[PDB]
Amino acid sequence: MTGRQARAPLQFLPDEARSLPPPKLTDPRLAYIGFLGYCSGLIDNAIRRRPVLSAGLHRQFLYITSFVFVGYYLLKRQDYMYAVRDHDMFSYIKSHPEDFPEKDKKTYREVFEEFHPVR
Amino acid sequence: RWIARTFFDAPEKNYERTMAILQIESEKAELRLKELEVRRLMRAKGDGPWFQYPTIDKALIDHSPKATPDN
Amino acid sequence: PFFDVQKKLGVDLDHWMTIQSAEQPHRIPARCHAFEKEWIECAHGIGSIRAEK
Amino acid sequence: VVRDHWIHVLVPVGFVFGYYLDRKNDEKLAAFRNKSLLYKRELKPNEEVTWK
Amino acid sequence: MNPIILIIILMTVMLGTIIVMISTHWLLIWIGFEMNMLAIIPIMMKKHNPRATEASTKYFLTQSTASMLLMMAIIINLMFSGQWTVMKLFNPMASMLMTMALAMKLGMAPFHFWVPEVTQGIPLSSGLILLTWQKLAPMSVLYQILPSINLDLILTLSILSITIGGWGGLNQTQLRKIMAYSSIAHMGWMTAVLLYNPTMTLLNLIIYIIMTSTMFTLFMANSTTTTLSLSHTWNKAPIMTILVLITLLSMGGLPPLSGFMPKWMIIQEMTKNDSIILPTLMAITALLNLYFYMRLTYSTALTMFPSTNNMKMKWQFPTTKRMTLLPTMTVLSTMLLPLTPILSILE
Amino acid sequence: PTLRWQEDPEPEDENLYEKNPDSHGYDKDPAVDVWNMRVVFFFGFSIVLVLGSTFVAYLPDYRMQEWARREAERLVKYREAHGLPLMESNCFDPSKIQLPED
Amino acid sequence: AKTLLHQYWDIPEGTECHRKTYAATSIGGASGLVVSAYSVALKTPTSFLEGVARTGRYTFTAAAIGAIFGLTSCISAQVREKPDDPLNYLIGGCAGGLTLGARTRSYGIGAAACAYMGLTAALVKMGQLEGWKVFAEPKV
Amino acid sequence: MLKYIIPTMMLMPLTWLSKNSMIWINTTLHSLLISLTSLLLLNQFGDNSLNFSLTFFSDSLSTPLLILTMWLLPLMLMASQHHLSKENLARKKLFISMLILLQLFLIMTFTATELIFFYIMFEATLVPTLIIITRWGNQTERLNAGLYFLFYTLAGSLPLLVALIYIQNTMGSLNFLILQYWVQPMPNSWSNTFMWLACMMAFMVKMPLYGLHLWLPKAHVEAPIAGSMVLAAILLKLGGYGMMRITLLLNPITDFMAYPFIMLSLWGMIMTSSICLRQTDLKSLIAYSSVSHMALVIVAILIQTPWSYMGATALMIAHGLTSSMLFCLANSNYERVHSRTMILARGLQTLLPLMAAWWLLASLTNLALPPSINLIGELFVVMSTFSWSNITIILMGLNMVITALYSLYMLITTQRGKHTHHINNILPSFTRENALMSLHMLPLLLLSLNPKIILGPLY
Amino acid sequence: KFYIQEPPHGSPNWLKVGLTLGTSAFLWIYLIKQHNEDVLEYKRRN
Amino acid sequence: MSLVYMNIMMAFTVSLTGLLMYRSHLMSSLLCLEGMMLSLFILATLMILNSHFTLASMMPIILLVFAACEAALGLSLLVMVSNTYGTDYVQNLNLLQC
């Protein structure tokens, strides 16, 4: 997609984003990001030859805080982008009627099918 | 009877789960075909908002009395 | 990408060098002023393929 | 004894948590509760439910 | 090489890339590419040896002739319809010259003969920073000028770039030439999708830069240039082994790891067009550029070469180098399979 | 005048017998071997094997079988009682059809 | 050039022979001149006489591949008269592969050339007859 | 089935923070808990599947295979000591957690709704087995074995993805139910043949078909025992599972382009059952035995009969059990004599007087003795193929004769008659090995009593 | 104990851990405040 | 079409081919880079004077100040090459073998 809010160039979220709900508490994707943050802390304890799962707990909580925060803002922008994609799609649906005809859904009483019986 | 009571989902429960999940997936598939239709027709016409690469911003064109009338 | 911090900060540092019919330093014409004014008045709110249609 | 060894109790807690998320999924996908054509009786008689 | 002056030169590399990112005027883009060249010369020759001298010579000649060919393209563009906007061009000849100048700059198969030569003799910091920025910045310009490109040009350069970067990579027993051939293959992939949906290309740019950052960070961790040294870093440093395992399989492109989200999303928004024979050819060649990764992984961790001693001396001294940002970039590069709907973060 | 190696002649037949002939299959800790006996001979044979055998010996009517038995009995009793031929062909309605005619 | 590969597709298939075969020789000689230009620019043949000899060998071999391919295509199309099946060009690719093996005077490389060239040529005719577009839509 | 997924994620870090001499009991006990938990699922009633929000469902195409995998995990694990016992505690934890991750992606693979997710979990099945067999393969070409494994499975499985994206953007989403309900036949064009050839060819390479079965035997002779059993049973039956899933679409052209594949599998079945008669390297006989049985499976899948599909899943489950067992006895013999060669290890009638009974019972289940479920599978496939062509029963019976011949020759060669009186190091057989025997075969006989479960969705 | 000529670190400073915990708790407070503002904005607009 | 544009584009293409094929002197390569600078200079300047587009006469001065500092960088590189060897030939650069 090309903007379609190619007016404000790096408006990270307009007031258009303040009408859809934000990502809620204990959504599974932010919990996945938090587990990835704990894994980042585990491997940061692993590389520096300090004991893994020990003596770096402030760094553990730092990494978890940072990744949960960044993933929260990414989820917000993500949901705004899919919402504006959906709304522009439906605006183009409602705009032009005649290019999108209602296909006359014939029931199976008259819809013929080639069969080719398999043995 | 006890095994079916304490462990197993009801056939009404499982059956209405199937019907609800087929309704959800039907909406998903119809919207996905609608999306590809919208994208192909919008690249065809160019009327829609998406495939509009930036042309000239005309805010800076001025007309003000020049140094030669044959502009 | 095509970032327009140019637009967002509100400083026109690169737009003044863009085409004819911009502000040539004293109020002079170019050779083809009017024909660009025609083309730019035709092709503003247009999605760059019906500018060629 | 549980605080001494908790090692042998973790995956039953995991299975209980998975089962609880299954029941939360059940009450999330609770559409067509009495709107099917083949499973459609009157809501009767206890309290406003047919499955959970 | 006073460190204040090195901070100045790195800020000028940043400045050249930002000037490329920021303008609508074509001469500013040419200034940005040139300032990028001028400051990326002395990130090389951080050592003294004349290998860096000859590598900087070859890189300077090819980079400057690509920049001059781009200036030819801009000047013929304004021989025709005269505007300073970065938009759809108004000359097929100028689009031809412009795509071939960018093909000489960021590496394509008729034009890549300087890339293992420049990456062989230089240190790893210079190689990392030139691979990241010199494969970043003209993707912005390509993203801008995409609506006026003959598709034969980009597509032929991309096919041939993937297959040459694959066929060259099997033989080298170095490391930098393996990484450079992989760079050519990924630039062929990142160019091949440009005319269809460029969000795919720019997200491939993000993922490839994260991958190359993890790679050259794990090679800054231990001064290794041959696979023999990789075996000795198996025997001296054990977590490095499994990280080389995971990141090398992620450069391979295997699905439960996060090297798959670039390729497969490209194939999705590629085969929604009527091109099927070309994605299956390209992805069989992406099967081809994985064998040198496999022999590299074999030489590191899956097999255990005999190791020279004095590691008995080295065991008292742990890995006391500096790491740029190793764990964050690592677990961002590896465990990012299920966030495929962070496709749409880009636009 | 050359060797190409340095390593020791290794390993040996570390018999798991000749130390603990009462012991069971795996390694040299003579308590947790008894614990392994307990866990794999109570949780593989006692609580899993015969419980699964009695679970598969009777579970509900898998693939609706006894339901199908009794329903077929009642339907054949119906189609005996009404004199119409049991299992008439054309399971779909022969009137409710639209052949594509020439 | 695109104009004369379009000339090679311009003959009905069908037979208008000597012309399909001459177009095949032209395409093969152009490809041989391309590969000979690469192989003279990347080797320094030292000297110009050997460069002329190597270019002559590569152009004559690629043009002979084109010639023998056009010959067996023309004869198979005249005999069996079926523009549907690409089996005629399967035979054509194997004949070109065996003659490539003859011009390199090996047998294993020639048999592999028969296999690979026959399958790719049958694929080319098969995808042209069903219709698979060249390089792009480029639309969506 | 997320109540099966999340205990597997809650089983892995326990092994990481398990102390010394306590990794084993924890992993074994909790995997047996997972086995009872797996046994809870078996509920598939009548008309439909049993669905679960979008990702999960269960059929009898998937339920006995899933129960097979989760039953196989403790058996896998308890085969996998005493040949890495002197290795590090950290490397032991790494190996066991790698197997747990492989089980997790296998459950992901068998409980899949979309074929896209099936492709992701297919090569997720691919990746850990590489590292396992190449690291611990314990011979000089475990390198070559892992490399052939990975390149054949990728290079076959890859254009399947492009065909699946094509089916995605031509028919909407890719639920198995929508593809039951929105499918329509695609006639004999050429591109239909190419798409069918890509999908079926990816699965052919996974089976293995006879054209590309050099894939297998190096990866069986050059693997540790856990990866051996996983590779053989779960990977080949996973390939057949995936073919049974995809073949519901594209019916009308398989009659036109299935004739080379059926022929190739039949003649390759005869040639493979002949080649596993006369080789050395006792391990590899069961490898080509598995090749022969999966060739029979392929013929059964593509001749498209309900009898054929019931016999196909029966043959899958029976051969998975029998081949996993017989690999474990081969590992016991290699623990004894340190050879892998057939003619060296001899005797074992005086010596080891009841290990021989498990060799006998395994070779009789392989022989298709008539209460073995192998015979139920082979019998239904023979009925269907004689309905298919009325003359191909001769290849079936010749396969039958040669199958009984090589299996019983493998029995009586090494294990009937005379010790070489220079071996003199075998101990009497451990309780662990016999425990793996009675964990293999007691569910086989107790499934052989009431086998109405394991037959397919066309019950 | 057991060391010679220094332990280089291991005895941490008392500005870096306080800095990291302070900015971490600050970012948690800021994201909680952000979520409360967003729920208020959603329920005020709809 | 203003016929002088043909000869200036001809001079560009000849200077480009001279930049590409070269015998032994890297000095001559930098010299043809300088000539190609001059060719683009004169063509862009005659463009701007045909157009009377005299707001943007920045192309000549800025193009040649930048490309001349490029040529200065190349000259210092040639100083370094001739320092660490005897001459500046294309031969005795064949080390760092690919």
C20/J53 touch (CB, cutoff 8 Å), yes or no: yes
| A93 in contact with chain B, both atoms CB, cutoff 8 A | yes
The two tokens of residue H253 are: 């052209």
Q: How many residues belong to chain A?
A: 119
CA distance H457 to H60: 5
Contacts of E88 in chain B (CB under 8 A): 53
Contacts of B52 in chain C (CB under 8 A): 46-48
Domain that holds residue D36: 1-51
CA D29 to chain centre: 11
Query: B-D interface: how many C-beta pairs under 8 angstroms?
Result: 25
- For E43, the enclosing helix (H) or strand (E) is none
Nearest one of J42, J29, J30, J26 to J68, comparing CA atoms: J30
- 3-state DSSP helix/strand/coil % of chain A, to nearest 5: 55, 0, 45
Q: Which long-range contacts (CB under 8 A, 24 or more apart) does E314-320 make?
A: E314/E236, E315/E236, E318/A48, E318/A49, E319/A47, E319/A48, E319/A49, E319/E221, E319/E222, E319/E237, E319/E240
CA-nearest of H229, H411, H261, H245 to H331 is H229
Cα separations in angstroms, C35 against C38, E245, E291: 5, 63, 59
State both tokens at E347.
């636009």
The residues on H that touch B, with CB distances below 8 Å, are: 40, 43, 45, 48-54, 169, 171-173, 175, 177-178, 182
Question: Residue A76 carries which side chain, given as an amino acid letter?
Answer: K
Q: Which residue has the tokens 């295979």?
A: H65
Rounded (10°) CA dihedral D8, D11, D13, D19: -150
Amino acid, res. J30: L
On whether the CB atoms of residues H128 and H102 are closer than 8 A, the answer is: yes
Task: Count the domains in chain D.
Answer: 1
Unique residue bearing structure tokens 């005309």: B58
Q: Provide Rg for chain E, Cα atoms.
A: 21
* H31: nearest Cα among F43, F42, D5: F43
CB-based contacts of G90: which residues, under 8 Å, 6+ apart? G118, G119, G121, G122
Alpha carbon of H163 to those of E258, E287, H209: distances in Å?
22, 17, 20
* Nearest of H219, H222, H195 to residue H206 by alpha carbon: H219
Residue F73: which H helix or E strand, with range?
helix F65-81
CB H315 within 8 A of CB H377: yes
In angstroms, the separation between the Cα of residue G137 and the nearest Cα of chain E is 6
**Residue J89's beta-bridge partner residues?**
J25
* φ/ψ (deg, to 5) at C4: -120, 50
Neighbouring-strand partners of residue I32? none
Residue contacts between A and B (CB atoms, under 8 Å): 28
Provide the residue ranges of all domains of chain J, joining segments of one domain with +.
1-86
- Structural domain count, chain E: 1
Per the CB < 8 A criterion, the answer to whether F23 and F16 are in contact is yes
Q: Do F25 and H433 touch (CB under 8 A)?
A: yes
Query: How far apart, in Å, are the Cα atoms of H273 and each of C48, E306, G51?
Result: 67, 42, 57
Structure tokens at H348: 């074992």
Does residue C48 come out as left (phi exceeding 0), alpha (psi in the -120 to 50 range) or beta?
Answer: left
Query: Which of F26, F29, F54, F64 has the most H C-beta neighbours within 10 Å, making it the best mutation to test the interface with H?
Result: F26
Buried-exposed string H186-201: b where 16+ CB fall within 10 A, e elsewhere: beeebebbbbbbbbbb
- Chain B contact for E284 (CB, 8 A cutoff): no
- Amino acid identity of residue J59, one-letter, is M
What one-character-per-residue DSSP string does E183-217 give?
HHHHHHHHHHTTTT-HHHHHHHHHHHHHHHHHHHH
Spatial CA neighbour of H11 closest among D15, E170, J54, A114:
D15
Which neighbouring-strand residues pair with H51? H57
Task: Determine the 3-state secondary structure of E324 from DSSP.
Answer: coil
Q: Quick one: closest CA in B to D40, which residue? A: B12
What six digits make up the tokens of D41? 């009786």
Q: Residue E82's closest CA among J56, J65, C25, J40?
A: J56
User: By the 8 A CB rule, do E253 and E259 touch?
Assistant: yes
Which of H7, H27, H8 is closest to H17 using CA atoms? H27
Taking alpha carbons only, the member of E260, A32, E211 closest to residue H124 is: E260
Q: How far apart are CA A40 and CA F20, in angstroms?
A: 46
Residue F64, judged by CB atoms within 10 A of its CB (0-12, 13-18, 19+), counts as middle
Q: Which of H97, H150, H174, H196 to mutate to test the interface with E (most CBs of E within 10 A)?
A: H150
Q: Answer yes or no: are the C-beta atoms of E140 and E21 closer than 8 Å.
A: yes
> Residue holding tokens 């509760």?
D33
> How far is residue H195 from each of residues A103, H209, H265, H435, measured CA to CA in Å?
28, 18, 21, 47
What are the Cα distances from residue H30, in Å, to H68, H71, H436? 16, 12, 17
Residue H76 token pair: 């896998």
Q: Which chains touch B (3 or more CB pairs under 8 A)?
A: A, C, D, E, F, G, H
Which of A86, A89, A94 is most worth mutating to test chain B (most B CB atoms within 10 A of its CB)? A89
Nearest to F27 among H22, H33, H85 (CB): H85
Beta carbons within 10 angstroms of residue G131's beta carbon: 9
CA neighbours within 13 Å on the CB side: how many for J28? Answer: 13
- Second-level CATH architecture of J1-86: Orthogonal Bundle (1.10)
Residue C2 neighbours by CB distance under 10 Å: 21
The residues facing H62 across adjacent strands are none
Q: Which member of B35, B47, B51 has the closest CB to residue A89?
A: B35
**Three-point CA angle H166, H172, H178, nearest 5°:** 110
Kindly tell me whether chain G and chain F come into contact, counting contact as 3+ Cβ pairs under 8 Å: no
For residue A7, the chain C residues in CB contact (below 8 A) are 7
DSSP annotation of D29: S
Decide: E272 and E152 in contact? Cβ < 8 Å: no
Domain that holds residue H452: 1-459
Q: CA H428, H434, H439 angle in degrees (round to 5)?
A: 175
The candidate with the shortest Cα–Cα distance to E289, out of E151, E179, E209, E205, is E179
Give the integer Cα–Cα distance in Å for F48 and F31: 24
Interface list for chain A against chain F, based on CB atoms closer than 8 Å = 109-110, 112
Residue in H450, H444, H445 with CA at minimum distance from that of residue H317: H444
Angle at F30 between CA F26 and CA F31, to 5 degrees: 110
Nearest to E157 by CA among E204, E112, E90: E112
How far is H237 from H240, CA to CA, in rounded Å?
5
Strand partners, H52: H56
Eight-state DSSP code of residue E302 = I
E244's CB contacts (< 8 A; 6+ apart) are E218, E230, E296, E297, E300, E301
Q: Judged by CB atoms within 8 Å, which residues 298-337 of E form the interface with G?
A: none
Taking one residue from D and the other from H, the number of pairs with CB-CB distance under 8 angstroms is 49
DSSP B68: -
Q: H-helix or E-strand containing H57?
A: strand H56-58
Phi-psi region of J52 (alpha: psi -120 to 50; beta: other; left: phi over 0): left
Q: Which of F24, F61, F62 sits opposite H431 (nearest CB)?
A: F24
Nearest to H3 among D8, D10, D22 (CB): D22
Determine the Cα–Cα distance for residues A48 and H403; give it in Å rounded to an integer: 58
Closest listed residue to residue H235, CA positions, set H81, H342, H132:
H132
Contact F53, H445 (CB under 8 A): no
The C-alpha atoms of residue F55 and residue F43 are separated, in whole angstroms, by: 16
The answer to whether E340 contacts chain G (CB < 8 Å) is: no
Which ranges constitute the DSSP H helices of chain E?
A: 3-22, 26-40, 50-79, 92-106, 115-120, 124-145, 151-169, 176-192, 198-220, 227-236, 238-252, 261-271, 277-288, 291-297, 311-314, 326-334
Size of interface G-H (CB pairs under 8 A): 7
> What sign for the dihedral angle of Cα H6, H10, H16, H18?
negative
Compute the nearest-CA separation of H63 from chain D (Å): 19
Q: Report the interhelical angle of H431-449 vs F49-57 (nearest 10°).
A: 0
Give the CA angle between residues H178, H184, H186 to the nearest 5°: 135
Distance from CA of G134 to the nearest CA of B (A): 19
In this complex, is the C-beta atom of B3 within 8 Å of any C-beta atom belonging to chain C? no
Which residues have a Cβ under 8 Å from the Cβ of E202 and sit 6 or more positions away?
C1, E139, E143, E346
Query: What are the two backbone dihedrals, phi and then psi, of residue E81, each rounded to the nearest 5 degrees?
Result: -45, 115
SS3 A9: coil
Q: Is G105 near chain B, with CB under 8 Å? A: no
Q: Is A108 on the interface with H (CB under 8 A)?
A: no
Angle between helices H355-366 and H306-337 (to 10 degrees): 150
DSSP assignment of C1-53, as one string? ----HHHHTT--SSGGGSSTTS--SSS---SSHHHHHHHHHHSSSS-SSTTT-
CA separation for the pair I46, H228 (Å, rounded): 60
CB atoms within 10 A of CB H433: 20
**d(CA D51, nearest CA chain H) in Å:** 15
H/E run at residue I8: none
G127–E277: do the CB atoms touch at under 8 Å?
yes
User: What's the Cα-to-Cα distance from E285 to each of E157, E291, G113, rounded to whole Å?
Assistant: 14, 11, 20
Q: Which chains touch F (3 or more CB pairs under 8 A)?
A: A, B, H
Contact in structure between J43 and J5 (CB atoms under 8 Å): yes
**What is the DSSP-derived secondary structure letter of residue H231?**
I
Please give the distance of CA H391 from its chain centroid, rounded to a whole number: 30
**H54 contacts in B (CB within 8 Å)?**
21, 24-25
* Subunit contact A2:B53, Cβ cutoff 8 A: yes
- How many CA atoms are closer than 13 Å to the CA of H61, on its beta-carbon side? 25
Q: What is the rounded CA–CA span in Å between residue E202 and residue E177?
A: 24
Among B11, B25, B32, beta carbon nearest to H45: B11
- Pairing mode, strands H56-58 and H50-52: antiparallel
Residue recorded with tokens 């060819």: H201
The whole-angstrom separation of Cα H43 and Cα H368 is: 29
Cα torsion at J22, J23, J26, J27 (round to 10°)? -90
User: E40: closest CA among E100, E119, E111?
Assistant: E119
Query: 3-state SS of chain J: helix, strand, coil percent to 5?
Result: 70, 0, 25
Q: Are F26 and H81 in contact (CB under 8 A)?
A: yes
Residue H15, SS3? helix
Chains A and I touch (3+ CB pairs under 8 A): yes
Q: Is H304 left (phi over 0), alpha (psi -120 to 50) or beta?
A: left
Q: Which two tokens stand for residue E14?
A: 């940043």
Give CA angle at H245 (H242, H248), nearest 5°: 140
G136 touches chain B (CB under 8 A): no
Nearest-Cα distance to chain E for C16, in Å, is 10
3+ Cβ–Cβ pairs closer than 8 Å linking J and I: no
CB contact under 8 A, A92 and B51: no
Whether residue E255 has a cis bond before it, omega within 30° of 0: no
